[PDB]
């Protein structure tokens, strides 16, 4: 290129190994020892921590979960950062052959009864509604806690969340989910090309893809197990004031991911040798489109025909046509 010439010049230019008077080398050792040595496995402790807390008066873990629910129930118009929350949501998400396989199933079901006895369903279902449309790391940790409890398609938790949303009748939660899907990601048009040119001269694209593979996994797990009442509640939303039809919104996100896939394809339609960046980016978009198709299976799956009709009049079909024009030429 151009600046790579000056870089190759500077590689020879940086001739001193370790003249480095005495302590610049100490400092660079300090940074390298930070990066490649401290980040190790510590994480035996999570289940030990929670079995150390879930011990009987109201239990300590119920004190903690009730603290986060009373923080989420206030009025701030913008959530905090809460490194306390960002630590304990990650702890409560790290802490969740045939007869051995039902034994594994039964201990997972116990490790989620460890939380959702103490209202850990409701603090997730509150901290999503409290952060209005914001896609911060807060909502990321709340979604990972909501997935780490529903992970087997648990049904006490689904019924617990549905009874909660029908009592404290939230338009904020479904408003907040549509507002989360409103951004979430695209794939790209041109930030990849700019990212590639910068990499070529000086020496992301899906910045937060994994938030979307948490969000649509969370929406999958509320309906997995054929909750026809919850599958219908994501559509019609009866008691609340202004219903938010979440299923046409996830159709719209599938359409946006489709068109960004198709207009990544037209970029690669002529060059015909896909790079490493193109593969690492392309599979990273393929997972998100695969995920939202798995959710649209899980809304329809038990034949709740109202949901099939409300999705069949959506703009599903343009997205399916575009996936076929990707598929034929790409295969």
């Amino acid at each position: 290129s151009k600046q790579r010439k000056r870089a190759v010049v500077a590689c020879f230019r940086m001739a001193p190994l370790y003249n480095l008077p005495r302590h610049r080398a100490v400092n660079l050792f300090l940074q390298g020892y930070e990066k490649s040595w401290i980040e190790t496995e510590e994480h035996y402790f999570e289940d030990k921590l929670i079995e150390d807390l879930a011990k009987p008066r109201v239990d300590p873990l119920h004190q903690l979960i009730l603290l986060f629910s009373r923080t989420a129930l206030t009025e701030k118009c913008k959530l905090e950062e809460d490194f306390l929350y960002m630590a304990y949501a990650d702890i409560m998400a790290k802490s969740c052959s045939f007869e051995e396989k039902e034994m594994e199933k039964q201990k997972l079901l116990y490790q989620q009864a460890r939380l959702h006895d103490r209202g850990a369903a409701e603090m997730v279902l509150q901290t999503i509604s409290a952060s209005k449309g914001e896609t911060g790391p807060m909502v990321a940790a709340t979604l990972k806690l909501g997935i780490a409890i529903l992970n087997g398609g648990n049904s006490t938790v689904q019924q617990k969340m549905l009874e909660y949303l029908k009592e404290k009748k939230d338009v904020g939660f479904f408003q907040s989910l549509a507002g989360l899907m409103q951004s979430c990601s695209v794939l790209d048009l041109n930030a990849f090309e700019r990212q590639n040119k910068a990499e070529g001269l000086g020496m992301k694209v899906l910045q937060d893809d994994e938030f979307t593979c948490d969000l649509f996994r969370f929406l999958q797990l509320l309906c997995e197990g054929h909750n026809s009442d919850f599958q219908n509640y994501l559509r019609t939303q009866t008691g609340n004031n202004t219903t938010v039809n979440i299923i046409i919104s996830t159709v719209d996100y599938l359409l946006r991911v489709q068109e960004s896939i198709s207009d990544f394809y037209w970029y690669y339609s002529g060059k015909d040798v896909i790079d490493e960046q193109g593969q690492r980016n392309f599979s990273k978009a393929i997972q998100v489109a695969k995920q939202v198709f798995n959710t649209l299976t899980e809304y329809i799956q038990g034949p709740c025909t109202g949901n099939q009709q409300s999705l069949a009049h959506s703009r599903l079909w343009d997205a399916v046509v575009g996936f076929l024009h990707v598929f034929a030429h790409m295969q």
Partner: protein, 363 residues
Amino acid sequence: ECLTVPSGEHEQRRTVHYEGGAVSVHARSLWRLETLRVAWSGSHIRWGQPFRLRHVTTGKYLSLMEDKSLLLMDKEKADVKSTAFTFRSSKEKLRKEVDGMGTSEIKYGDSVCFIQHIGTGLWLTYQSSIQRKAIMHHEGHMDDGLNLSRSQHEESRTARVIRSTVFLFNRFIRGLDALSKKAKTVDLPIESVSLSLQDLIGYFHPPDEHLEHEDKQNRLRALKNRQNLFQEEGMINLVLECIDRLHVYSSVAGREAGESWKSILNSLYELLAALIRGNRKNCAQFSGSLDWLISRLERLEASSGILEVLHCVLVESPEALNIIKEGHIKSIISLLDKHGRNHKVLDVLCSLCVCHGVAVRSN
């Protein structure tokens, strides 16, 4: 985008605009669908049966006066063919007699409701800085498809409380303006004012301490909603001016029925405390008129109310502290040297000394 009526004191409140954004959540974007029938008025609203609209915050109707314009007029003026509208799903010009709540016709979230006048058949459409005026027109544009969102219950409650309070206090201000220039007679409400005023002190009542955290936060949210709507309709300015026009004689009007003047000033300063005590927005909008309070502060009879309002403004906004200056602070220290030893004066000085976290060193 939404309908509106323009803001306070511009007209005497008769035009029609649009605006989008944050005027939807306010008070003055509210319209009440009255019908022709008294009996079974709460039937379902059907495609093509007549309706009126009513501005819920000033009390006027949407009477298309085909002589002139699209105005807002009263009960005594407005008549049926001038204001009976219809709602369709198409822009075309192709029932009436039922009992029961009838056929559930129109949705809120899924409805493209075109407003069609009956008498002249005109259509509510928009012209071409966003104060985009809506106009009645025989043909219309393509995007006259007004969707409907109902209000909540408690916003309708606060909305009707607004026009009740305004229609009472303009009577009270005009009564003081009549009886203040010349020596009387002229009827002036006192017991209606005292009852309404203790009611509005009860209406902005703070939540308790002894309450569950969920209901306490819900009560505090409804309180902030109420304070915000009375800010954006201009009650603080109105009550402020009434406190001006009362704070002249020291106890002209009938001095058996002008004997409640003392507790009416007590209640007006306590209510002025009540329309501020939570919101930073409202005491921030209030912060222009602070020398007014500090000037009336040394009036020896209402200084409790002035001082509580002053403290509840100075705590909850750091924008108020930058307007306050040396003469005001010297006046408060002189209040301390007139009226013995309060601890409230020292709470005012403590909160005037430090903001939320930022101290102010010259002060």
